[PDB]
Write a protein that binds this ligand. Structure first.
Ligand SMILES: OC[C@@H]1[C@@H](O)[C@H](O)[C@@H](O)c2[nH]cc[n+]21
Ligand SMILES: [Zn+2]
Length: 471
């Protein structure tokens, strides 16, 4: 049932944790002095989320955080990845501090440390203060580097004597893709969209500003706080694996373009100080140019790379064509394929995009090892979902999730035993929670949350982790 996995199967002092994000678990969305984020406005508009649900209450971790910390300690985890809500600290994103918000994160951080659990703190997880969206146009505006740097500075000052493991952003690719290419997440921008936009240009502007903002915040950390605090700052990037459908030159090149457009988009700047060459060749003057000084600030600005790894796809190629620009997604010039030799790549979880493909974990980790000089990587999310409307006991008997983690972690072990510099692994999620457009219809937790009573109940997968992680 453990399949030979234990702490002895991973490197000495490998970090095991679970993950949430602020809007997905906290609740108290319009209480405790918190200002609205772009997701509050989006979720409150009829038809945007499944069942018109929102994160007003969520799991109510805001009031129950000590229960949840005790629970993660009893399951033998070493660390907890959570995010700080920018609008809980600065209701307008700038100016006035909400002291009640500050006290909440102080209390959470202090309790975690009291119970021997290491906090890994994300500054941003999709939840841009609405005031900054309206006043500045959000991530389309280069001024976000200053605005984010001032917010990060406050967080380093206020929490950094205790917090030593920071991330700036969670998955800027998804913000760019869903917010500005397809227009399905806030601010709902795209070429077609009612709010305006341009799917060929805005995704690249947004990504550039995430990178400049990350670099500016880290430069602030390094010049003002690191000497005294001695912590680290990284960034979280999504990476799903792409496998060539066949060994042809065409299909191998398609898979590699997909890798470069997905992960290279951010990794090449963070490691090598430039965008991928293929992106420069295909996107051209729609891709912003780093000045030498900006490139030098961005290069080497992550002390570790967070990887959110879930799934994999086959990629099929074609001849590279001259084309009128339409979108970030169309720029790749690839065809997604989800079967090979008459067999699917894997079975799906509840989320249509989530194909259960354990060898993709090996694919991603090995690729980053071999291509980017083996940087320090943390697996910052990995997990799968159950559907809505099951009984409690059905949720608890999550044998598919047990199998998911045994398989994926075996594949992670394989990459590490071959020399990949992976420092940690974090399971998405500690709790069933608000799953963005799916609302409460998608259950990612190792702990079940009854959303009528808010009671927590560990699933078999939680007990699997407890067995596997015991000292
Ligand atoms: O879809 C499940 C989870 C979300 O709940 C997280 O917020 C997000 O970080 C993410 N990226 C990939 C998968 N997921
Ligand atoms: Zn409450």
């Amino acid at each position: 049932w453990l399949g030979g996995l234990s702490r002895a199967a991973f490197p000495k002092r490998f970090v095991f944790g679970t993950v949430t994000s602020a809007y997905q678990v906290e609740g108290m969305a319009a209480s405790g002095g918190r200002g609205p984020s772009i997701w509050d406005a989006f979720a409150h508009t009829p038809g945007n989320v499944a069942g018109n649900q929102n994160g007003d209450v969520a799991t109510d971790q805001y009031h129950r955080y000590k229960e949840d910390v005790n629970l993660m300690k009893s399951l033998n985890f070493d660390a907890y990845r959570f995010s700080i809500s920018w609008s809980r600290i600065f209701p307008d994103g700038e100016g006035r501090v909400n002291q009640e918000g500050v006290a909440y994160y102080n209390n959470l951080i202090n309790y975690l440390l009291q119970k021997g659990i290491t906090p890994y703190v994300n500054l941003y997880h999709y939840d841009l203060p609405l005031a900054l969206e309206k006043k500045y146009g959000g991530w389309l505006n280069a001024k976000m580097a200053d605005l984010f740097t001032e917010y990060a500075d406050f967080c380093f000052k206020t929490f950094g004597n205790r917090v030593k493991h920071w991330f700036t952003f969670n998955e800027p690719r998804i913000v760019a893709l869903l917010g500005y290419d397809q227009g399905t997440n806030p601010p709902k921008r795209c070429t077609k969209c009612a709010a305006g936009g341009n799917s060929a240009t805005e995704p690249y502007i947004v990504a550039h500003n995430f990178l400049l903002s990350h670099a500016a915040a880290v430069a602030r950390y390094r010049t003002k706080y690191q000497a005294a605090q001695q912590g680290k700052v990284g960034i979280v990037l999504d990476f799903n694996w792409y496998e060539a459908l066949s060994n042809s030159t065409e299909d191998q090149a398609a898979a590699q373009r997909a890798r470069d457009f997905h992960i290279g988009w951010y990794l090449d700047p963070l490691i090598n100080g430039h965008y991928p060459q293929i992106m420069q060749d295909l996107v051209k003057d729609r891709l912003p140019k780093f000045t030498p000084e900006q490139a030098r600030l961005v290069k080497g600005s992550a002390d570790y790379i967070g990887i959110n790894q879930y799934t994999a796809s086959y990629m099929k190629g074609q001849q590279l064509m001259q084309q009128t620009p339409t979108s970030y997604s169309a720029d790749w010039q690839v065809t997604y394929v989800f079967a090979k030799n008459g067999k699917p790549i894997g079975p799906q979880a509840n989320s249509n995009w989530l194909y259960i493909v354990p060898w993709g974990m090996y694919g991603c980790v090995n690729y980053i090892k071999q291509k980017y000089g083996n940087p320090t990587v943390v697996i910052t999310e990995n997990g799968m979902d159950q559907p809505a409307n099951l009984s409690r006991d059905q949720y608890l008997r999550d044998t598919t999730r047990v199998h998911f983690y045994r398989s994926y972690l075996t594949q992670l072990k394989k990459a590490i035993d071959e020399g990949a510099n992976v420092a940690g692994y974090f399971a998405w999620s500690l709790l069933d929670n608000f799953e963005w457009l799916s609302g409460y219809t998608s259950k990612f937790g190792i702990v079940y949350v009854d959303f009528n009573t808010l009671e927590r109940h560990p699933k078999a997968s939680a007990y699997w982790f407890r067995d596997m992680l015991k000292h």
